[PDB]
């Protein structure tokens, strides 16, 4: 077993969860957190509170509870919402509008500060478009969208500071920091693209695709054991890992699945465990290595069909053992993803992991949380 | 590889020191121009005259920064018989707004009527004190009780250090079984006097500094004095700057059993002595890891000395401000 | 002053009963500093113009 979950039937759909920040560096769960609607009653942003950690919280249902605090309603879905600083909030609208609040935790309200009413858009049809990814390193702000523009802003402005346009742009899937002012994305072509914040121009700053079954890569993130090595997931089911600050090269091409990796996210307390969420109809915890000989988070969960918690250790006297990482030739095997279904769940659209603690809101009209990811 | 200009900042007078942030990016120049100029290495690195305000009277010899857990606080000394204290306080709450800054004299220690030859904060482990020395042979030792209570300064202790105080040094200490000590190099001129450097310890049961040692050997006006950073180093080393270069190893051979304090049994070796500068050696600067020493003198050169796996010491750099130094160098036996 | 760990540990039992909590301590509270600040406080509150009790404690010390 692995520290069973608290499920709170919130009677609500969830799209975006993002920790209320206090910047600097600390371990606690932000009890305060802002929530973007999938469709709760409308599309809105709500303020919610979670009794952090199994300590001082084993109550208010079973193992804690998040609680609604206030809310304010928002045109265009909250596909993405990141926090500039402790109480300045930046969300994208499906209406193609960049929205910034200053939250009032004591007044339990959100202040409608700054709006870039103008964003990514379609040409030849004159239609508006949402934003694919927001990038917040205080106070510099980056926006990237379907049509492929670049939207570079200093904090606190209602007019575009700059939008880089190109004679060559495309659809963008996932973005990550490579450095403080260096940026990478995975695209819908099987495309790995690079830019520096200070230096840009016409057509993508840097473009990559190579042998290894280039598939539309949907999710990218920088490892919880290092940032300049990053991981990407796409259609083919194989995870691609790279080391850059100006040049790409593969750590691994792990045959971790047979189908699209929609979103991947990284374990803090375990810089080498992963999670994946997918509206293919499933959600997996990803673990180092494979085989049921180690605690199986390959078939773990699913109510029944449960398997995990197997172990054996050589004393290194006359015993030898080898594993996959010790091979550098590409095309490695599966690495232990388990899909979990308690009794029934719908599209989980937002999740968060802090330490071995996990929260996640869904289209299953409820919230699922655990204190510990293992046992 | 930065070529040297003789071009200098707009200070119309001699520039005394420059002090850098104990957390980075921030520097400040103190001069005889009487205006203190705070420069800030930008993200591009371009440091510009971000602040410049008057702080003292007379030649402001030294500016010393303190870690922000001290507050963003600084001490400064000059020909004013006193020592000035400035913390930079800003308005408003720093979330995504940056208000207006302002220089704050938390205090200025009058230091009797004596010119502050050296002044600097106190180390972490011993509480939060600060030390001032003067050509009076008297070292004043001031105290601020609480975290928001900065401006107030009470002479917690004073150590009378015989000849006029010139250069001071705190002993690094991080063990409750260890004690804080101070070394004092004297720039008074007396060939007669040995032990021109005096060494004091805190005997805790006495609650007080006693004289630990002197360097009965020294009759040369000490330019500067510098403990080696020693906290994992199970003994201590001292760098001593005058016309030559003195390097001493101080190992606890007997720590007493019922008579500790007053003096504790240390072996001291002159583990190095050099005139390689061929002139009077002003300052020796340690690496923060306590493994590297830089040395400069009148000839405007700096020689760079390290310990080996026998811990012995070599010059690993010779840098010329009156000329152009040569390239790389390596050797074994 | 003549005792040690057991002495200070027990002395805290009555230092708390005398209720001193204000002012930050460095490197954790030590019964020595505790008594010193306690006596300083007793001074600064009850202040005789003639150092009577200065004398009293000095003479017990001697």
UniProtKB/Swiss-Prot annotation, chain B:
Q: Which domain of life is it from?
A: Eukaryota
The biological processes this protein is annotated with in GO are: attachment of mitotic spindle microtubules to kinetochore; cell division; cellular response to amino acid starvation; cellular response to nutrient levels; mitotic metaphase chromosome alignment; mRNA transport; nuclear pore organization; positive regulation of TORC1 signaling
GO terms of molecular function: structural molecule activity
Ranges occupied by WD repeats: 10-49, 55-96, 111-152, 160-210, 217-258, 276-315
Among SMART domains, the record links this protein to: WD40
Q: Which GO terms describe its cellular component?
A: cytosol; GATOR2 complex; kinetochore; lysosomal membrane; nuclear pore outer ring; Seh1-associated complex
Tell where it localizes.
Answer: Chromosome, Centromere, Kinetochore; Nucleus, Nuclear pore complex; Lysosome membrane
Per UniProt, the keywords (alphabetical) are: Cell cycle, Cell division, Centromere, Chromosome, Chromosome partition, Kinetochore, Lysosome, Membrane, Mitosis, mRNA transport, Nuclear pore complex, Nucleus, Protein transport, Repeat, Translocation, Transport, WD repeat
Activity regulation as described: The GATOR2 complex is negatively regulated by the upstream amino acid sensors CASTOR1 and SESN2, which sequester the GATOR2 complex in absence of amino acids. In the presence of abundant amino acids, GATOR2 is released from CASTOR1 and SESN2 and activated.
UniProt cross-references to InterPro entries, sorted A to Z: G-protein_beta_WD-40_rep (IPR020472), Sec13/Seh1_fam (IPR037363), WD40/YVTN_repeat-like_dom_sf (IPR015943), WD40_repeat_dom_sf (IPR036322), WD40_rpt (IPR001680)
**Main subcellular location:** nucleus
Question: Which Pfam families does the UniProt record give?
Answer: WD40 (PF00400)
PANTHER family, alphabetically? NUCLEAR PORE COMPLEX PROTEIN SEC13 / SEH1 FAMILY MEMBER (PTHR11024), NUCLEOPORIN SEH1 (PTHR11024:SF3)
Function as written in the Swiss-Prot or TrEMBL entry: Component of the Nup107-160 subcomplex of the nuclear pore complex (NPC). The Nup107-160 subcomplex is required for the assembly of a functional NPC. The Nup107-160 subcomplex is also required for normal kinetochore microtubule attachment, mitotic progression and chromosome segregation. This subunit plays a role in recruitment of the Nup107-160 subcomplex to the kinetochore.
Can you state the subunit structure given in the record?
Answer: Component of the Nup107-160 subcomplex of the nuclear pore complex (NPC). The Nup107-160 subcomplex includes NUP160, NUP133, NUP107, NUP98, NUP85, NUP43, NUP37, SEH1 and SEC13. Component of the GATOR2 subcomplex, composed of MIOS, SEC13, SEH1L, WDR24 and WDR59. The GATOR2 complex interacts with CASTOR1 and CASTOR2; the interaction is negatively regulated by arginine. The GATOR2 complex interacts with SESN1, SESN2 and SESN3; the interaction is negatively regulated by amino acids.
Name the protein family: Belongs to the WD repeat SEC13 family.
| UniProt name for this protein | Nucleoporin SEH1-A
Species: Xenopus laevis
């Amino acid at each position: 077993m692995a520290d069973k979950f608290a499920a709170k039937f919130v009677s609500h759909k969830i799209s975006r969860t993002r920790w209320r920040p206090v910047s600097a560096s600390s371990l606690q769960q932000p009890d305060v957190f802002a929530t973007g609607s999938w469709d709760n009653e409308e599309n809105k942003v709500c303020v919610w509170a979670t009794s952090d950690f199994g300590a001082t919280s084993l109550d208010e249902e079973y193992q804690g509870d998040p609680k609604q605090l206030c809310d304010i309603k928002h045109p265009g879905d909250v596909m993405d919402m990141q926090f500039l600083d402790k109480e300045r909030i930046v969300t994208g609208s499906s209406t193609g509008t960049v929205t910034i609040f200053r939250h009032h935790e004591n007044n339990q309200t959100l202040s409608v500060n700054q709006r870039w009413e103008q964003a990514h858009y379609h040409v030849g049809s004159n239609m508006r478009a949402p934003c694919t990814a927001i990038v917040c390193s205080s106070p510099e702000i980056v926006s990237v969208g379907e049509d492929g523009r670049i939207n570079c802003f200093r904090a606190e402005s209602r007019d575009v500071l700059r939008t880089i346009d190109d004679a060559d742009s495309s659809t963008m899937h996932g973005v990550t920091f490579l450095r403080t002012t260096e940026i990478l994305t995975v695209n819908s072509v099987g495309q790995l693209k690079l830019w520096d914040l200070r230096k840009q121009g016409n057509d993508p700053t840097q473009i990559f695709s190579v042998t290894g079954e280039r598939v539309p890569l949907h999710c990218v993130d920088r490892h919880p054991n290092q940032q300049h090595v990053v991981a990407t997931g796409g259609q083919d089911g194989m995870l691609c890992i790279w080391d850059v600050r100006h040049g790409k090269m593969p750590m691994s091409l792990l045959n971790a699945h047979e189908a699209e990796m929609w979103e991947v996210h990284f374990h803090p307390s375990n810089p080498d465990h992963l999670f994946t969420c997918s509206e293919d109809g499933s959600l997996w915890h990803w673990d180092a290595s494979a085989d049921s000989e180690k605690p199986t988070f390959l078939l773990g969960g699913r109510s029944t069909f449960n398997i995990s918690r197997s172990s054996i250790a050589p004393p290194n006297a006359n015993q030898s053992l080898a594993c996959a990482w010790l091979s550098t030739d590409p095309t490695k095997g599966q690495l232990e993803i388990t899909n979990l279904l308690p009794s029934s769940t719908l599209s989980v659209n937002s999740l968060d992991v802090l330490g071995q603690n996990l929260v996640c809101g869904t289209d299953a009209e409820a919230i699922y949380v655990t204190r510990r990811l293992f046992s | 590889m930065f070529v040297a200009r003789s071009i200098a900042a707009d200070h119309k007078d001699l520039i005394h020191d420059v002090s850098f942030d104990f957390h980075g990016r921030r520097m400040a120049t103190c001069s005889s121009d009487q205006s203190v100029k705070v420069w800030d290495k930008s993200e591009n690195g371009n440091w510009h005259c971000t602040a410049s305000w008057k702080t003292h009277s007379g030649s402001v010899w030294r500016v010393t920064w303190a870690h922000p857990e001290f507050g963003q606080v600084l001490a400064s000394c000059s020909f004013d018989r006193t020592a000035a204290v400035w913390e930079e306080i800003v308005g408003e709450s720093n979330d995504k707004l940056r208000g207006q800054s302002h220089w704050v004299k938390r205090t200025t220690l009058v230091d009797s009527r004596t010119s502050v030859t050296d002044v600097k904060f106190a180390p972490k482990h011993m509480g939060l004190m600060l030390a001032t020395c003067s050509a009076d042979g008297v070292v004043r030792i001031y105290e601020a009780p609480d975290v928001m209570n900065l401006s107030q300064w009470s002479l917690q202790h004073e150590i009378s250090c015989k000849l006029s105080c010139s250069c001071i040094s705190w002993n690094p200490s991080s063990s409750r079984a260890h004690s804080p000590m101070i070394a004092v190099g004297s720039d008074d001129s007396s060939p007669n006097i040995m032990g021109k450097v005096q060494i004091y310890e805190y005997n805790e049961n006495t609650r007080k500094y006693a004289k630990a040692e002197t360097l009965m050997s020294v009759s040369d006006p000490v330019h500067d004095i510098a403990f080696a950073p020693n906290l994992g180093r199970s003994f201590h080393i001292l760098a001593v700057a005058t016309k030559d270069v003195r390097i001493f190893t101080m190992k606890p051979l007997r720590k007493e059993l019922s008579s500790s304090g007053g003096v504790t049994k240390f072996e001291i070796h002159t583990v190095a002595q050099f005139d390689n500068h061929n002139s009077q050696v002003w300052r020796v600067s340690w690496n923060i890891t306590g493994t590297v020493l830089a040395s400069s003198g009148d000839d405007g050169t700096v020689r760079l000395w390290k310990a080996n796996y026998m811990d012995n010491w070599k010059c690993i750099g010779v840098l010329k401000g009156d000329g152009n130094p040569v390239g790389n160098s390596y050797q074994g036996f | 002053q003549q005792g040690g760990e057991a002495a200070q540990a027990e002395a805290w039992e009555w230092l708390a009963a005398n209720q001193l909590a204000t002012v930050i301590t460095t490197k954790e509270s030590s019964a020595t500093d505790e008594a010193w600040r306690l006596m300083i406080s007793y001074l600064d509150k009850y202040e005789s113009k003639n150092t009577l009790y200065h004398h009293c404690i000095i003479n017990k010390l001697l």
